[PDB]
A paper describes a structure:
We coincidentally found that the R470A mutation of LGI1 enhances the expression level of the complex. The crystal structure of the LGI1R470A–ADAM22 ECD complex was determined at 7.13 Å resolution by molecular replacement using the crystal structures of the LGI1 EPTP–ADAM22 ECD complex and LGI1 LRR as the search models. The LGI1–ADAM22 complex structure forms a 2:2 heterotetramer in the asymmetric unit of the crystal. Two copies of the 1:1 LGI1–ADAM22 complex are aligned in a head-to-head configuration with ~90° rotation along the longest axis. The LRR and EPTP domains of LGI1 are connected by a 2-residue linker (Ile222–Ile223) and adopt an extended conformation. LGI1 EPTP interacts with the metalloprotease-like domain of ADAM22 in the same manner as in the LGI1 EPTP–ADAM22 ECD complex, whereas the LRR domain of one LGI1 molecule interacts with the EPTP domain of the other LGI1 molecule, thereby bridging two distant ADAM22 molecules in the complex. The high-resolution structures of the LGI1 EPTP–ADAM22 ECD complex and LGI1 LRR allowed us to interpret the 7.13-Å-resolution map and obtain the information of the intermolecular interactions between LRR and EPTP and that between LRR and ADAM22 ECD in the 2:2 heterotetrameric LGI1–ADAM22 complex: Glu123 and Arg76 in the LRR domain of one LGI1 likely form hydrogen bonds with Arg474 and Glu516 in the EPTP domain of the other LGI1, respectively. His116 of LGI1 LRR likely interacts with Glu446 in the disintegrin domain of ADAM22. It should be noted that two human ADLTE mutations, E123K17 and aforementioned R474Q, occur in the interface of the LGI1–LGI1 interaction in the 2:2 LGI1–ADAM22 complex.
LGI1 is a 60-kDa secreted neuronal protein, which consists of the N-terminal leucine-rich repeat (LRR) domain and the C-terminal epitempin-repeat (EPTP) (also known as EAR) domain4. ADAM22 serves as a receptor for LGI1 and is anchored to the excitatory postsynaptic density through PSD-95 scaffold. The LGI1–ADAM22 ligand–receptor interaction plays an essential role in AMPA-type glutamate receptor-mediated synaptic transmission via PSD-9533–35. In this study, we present the crystal structures of LGI1 LRR, LGI1 EPTP–ADAM22, and LGI1–ADAM22 at 1.78, 2.67, and 7.13 Å resolutions, respectively.
Author numbering:
A (entry chain A): 233 to 625, 630 to 718
B (entry chain B): 41 to 551
Write the structure that this text describes.
Amino acid sequence: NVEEETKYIELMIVNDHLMFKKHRLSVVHTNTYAKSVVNMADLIYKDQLKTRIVLVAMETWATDNKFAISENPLITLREFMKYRRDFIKEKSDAVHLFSGSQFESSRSGAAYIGGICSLLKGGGVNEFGKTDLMAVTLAQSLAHNIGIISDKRKLASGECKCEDTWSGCIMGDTGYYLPKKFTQCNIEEYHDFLNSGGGACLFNKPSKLLDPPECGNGFIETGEECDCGTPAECVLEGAECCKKCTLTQDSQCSDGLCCKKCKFQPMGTVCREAVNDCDIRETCSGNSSQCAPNIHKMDGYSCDGVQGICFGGRCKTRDRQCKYIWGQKVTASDKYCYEKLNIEGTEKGNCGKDKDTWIQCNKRDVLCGYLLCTNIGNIPRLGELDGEITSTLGRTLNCSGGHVKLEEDVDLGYVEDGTPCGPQMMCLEHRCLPVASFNFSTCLSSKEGTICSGNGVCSNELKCVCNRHWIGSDCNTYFPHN
Amino acid sequence: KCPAVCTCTKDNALCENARSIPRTVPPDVISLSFVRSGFTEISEGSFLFTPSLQLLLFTSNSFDVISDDAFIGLPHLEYLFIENNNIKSISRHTFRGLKSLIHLSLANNNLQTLPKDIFKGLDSLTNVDLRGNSFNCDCKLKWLVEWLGHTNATVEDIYCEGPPEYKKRKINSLSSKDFDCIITEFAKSQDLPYQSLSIDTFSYLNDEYVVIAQPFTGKCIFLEWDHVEKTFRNYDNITGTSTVVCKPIVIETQLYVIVAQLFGGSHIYKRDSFANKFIKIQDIEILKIRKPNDIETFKIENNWYFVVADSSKAGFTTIYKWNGNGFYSHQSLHAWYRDTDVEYLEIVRTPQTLRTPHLILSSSSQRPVIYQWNKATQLFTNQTDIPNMEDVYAVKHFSVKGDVYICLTRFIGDSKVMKWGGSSFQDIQAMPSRGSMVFQPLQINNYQYAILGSDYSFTQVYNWDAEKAKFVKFQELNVQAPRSFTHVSINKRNFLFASSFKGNTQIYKHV
Ligand SMILES: *[C@@H]1O[C@H](CO)[C@@H](O)[C@H](O)[C@H]1NC(C)=O
Ligand SMILES: *[C@@H]1O[C@H](CO)[C@@H](O)[C@H](O)[C@H]1NC(C)=O
Ligand SMILES: *[C@@H]1O[C@H](CO)[C@@H](O)[C@H](O)[C@H]1NC(C)=O
Ligand SMILES: *[C@@H]1O[C@H](CO)[C@@H](O)[C@H](O)[C@H]1NC(C)=O
Ligand SMILES: *[C@@H]1O[C@H](CO)[C@@H](O)[C@H](O)[C@H]1NC(C)=O
Ligand SMILES: [Ca+2]
Ligand SMILES: [Ca+2]
Ligand SMILES: [Ca+2]
Ligand SMILES: [Ca+2]
């Protein structure tokens, strides 16, 4: 499935000016030092999350800083991602900043949750430290991106605990004695995130690294035709196929989901099933040993009936957002709860806060206001609770809400942008706007009123995925083939 | 016929680059010389095929061993010149059977010793040359001093090249009186079957106790001295889930223990003389102190304090003050820093003449900081960095000849020793740190020691050299991942406790 596959984090490292000064203005020292950090973070990820951290790109600010580094990591993070948006043009699953400075917060770094594969959220920031220490810093930073958050609800309840009494666990507060392991709860969160449609860009396996070719690395580099892994694990897959990084007499490939006993899997074979109604299944090309790059439906497709709309392969519903913040047992409130409280614009329901005063929601922009849930608890799964939890009461409906702050600017407890508020309408900055307001791109279509000639689905790469027996970039040509 | 490696006349043979002592030297030769030879050993009876030798010369060779009876079977040998060679070992009976020997030279071989009775039975000796060697003047050389005093043979003045207190001393001028044969060492007392992080000692009601922090179990293990069985028993225990430090404070005969924990928070315990137990009387808040790593105690003008280094960011290094009933916050230092260790110092600031209280903080990827005590505001200020030092783990101070020094510890790279000179610290020496976590100075019986721990290799013990004004290699210990070294003094008996992070904590005896 999607959790038994080996994942790959295509990572880019940016070294700021202070990091450059720490290694005595040396480019080669900065590179090897960062590679050490990445490699050790990789060895952590490889063992437990079944995921590789592969360095694919790097640059170092040798002259001076591109922007002002803040003692606040969250402030620094945002300015870095702005730099990433406007100045970084190399491709990566995530871009992380290595700062030579030291932050004035409780954490040694900061990173957006569920951020990977994104241009604005796909990154994190990490402060300087010893090689082993910064590796842990990168691990917990990439953890947030990869969807791993220390569920405070299960932590407080005792549902999830670190069994390591001494070294502790990665998502915990770091001291001199460094952690080495994720909790089982962290693993499930990671599995849930992938099953939720996240981490789509993580299934492309890198080939040529930034280092000299190494036979027995699990990567097909320059000169070598294949690379099974380690001689121990090569026995499982690739033993008969690959000998000293060279294809045998009767072999087209070595290992992979589309490789069967040193031979290619025929075209049309399912190698990765859709994890949800936002995803597109992947079939073997027949010409490659690896399964096709994990793609999904573009932003705009509906999910959970008409209750949700796909964004980055994930379904944005008020129901899921409530489960995301307060727990799986929590469900979204009835629409009647919104239709009454949000219009008031009180503390118990509103469309935002403007200078000590709440905004009274409009009657159309009611589904884009204060988030309302049922059977709520008293501790969010993530972030900090700012204030108290709102609880409002033929049927009588219990409307519950709450202000959860990840950032000083970002407030969970309001309807997330992109959440449906009606037929072909979504929420944007606490306002119910039509689909045209989001300026979604479109695939090629040779039939009016249909997506991909009504014979295909528009992928997130803006390409048409044709149904069975249909071909062409517009999926209009019919192709009969047993 | 003459061997190929040799040049021969009727009476003489000169051999060069010989790979072994040739057995084919013409048996009528009376003088034989070996120069720049290949062979490394001279075994017994090596010259029996040339029984009429009167003279033998060895020069510019390298020997592993010259064995017993190497020169046996040579009753006419009157001259034996062994000079300008490298010689690893000479044996007691090397010259046995050389009753006719008139002149023996062992000059310029850089010999460090000679075995007792090496010259026994050499009754014809008129001359012995011993110059140009490197004799160590210790107990093993005692026989030579006596021999020099009694021999009729002519022997030139020769000099000790060691030990340092004997260097350039004329050996001919030594007596049996002068041998320093006694000397100290850290001998292994016992190995306690458990792991430990920090070890502390104190005096309670005129008995000496030892506190051991057990990280993995949770225990603060108190040890007590048995004056009849001459060992350490298990006095009492203190439970705390993740203890890092167990610092004892004795205020007016009452014992207090600060227990730093990584989990559940830190607490303060008080020993009860009546109930014969430890009581938990105070709780340090978990939010101000989160990741403690070191506790130090000190006294400034009849006021008691202690400082807790917090290796976390949100947790600030905080000073507490004794106010008769308990300890309370006095001052926070180094906000947002990952402070690893604290050290209390009493140092003279130029041009003052009196020592004033100082604090030193070590933090990750940062320079050590020196705080100065301000009597007016009753808090430490005026911080200054220690230059030349990046990523220092811990600092510890000692005093010799009134001057104040410190020991700077690194994990990798090189540890440093510095002297205080009025305004700042100055470089004295440096030592390679192979996974070092400790560089603890200790003063035992007015001897200044310095123990540099190592996780990768052996723990090195240093001694202070008065002539060199520096630490020198002394004894080499073997402990798994040492975390601390503490000196325990009980009734003229000096013990050395060595904490082990993965192996067994070890107790040493100083004799
Ligand atoms: C692999 O794909 C290329 C097109 O990208 C095609 O030209 C080639 O023939 C294919 N190889 C095989 C063995 O089918
Ligand atoms: C869509 O609208 C936003 C503002 O509403 C604008 O910034 C963006 O450029 C538009 N997209 C396109 C493709 O024009
Ligand atoms: C050395 O002199 C002493 C005089 O006391 C004499 O008895 C002894 O025989 C002499 N021995 C040698 C080897 O010269
Ligand atoms: C203290 O020692 C006793 C026996 O010596 C042992 O049974 C007990 O578990 C120990 N407790 C702690 C906290 O060290
Ligand atoms: C130290 O404190 C004194 C207070 O008299 C002040 O004049 C001086 O500037 C301070 N120096 C530093 C480095 O803080
Ligand atoms: Ca990728
Ligand atoms: Ca390879
Ligand atoms: Ca897919
Ligand atoms: Ca200390």
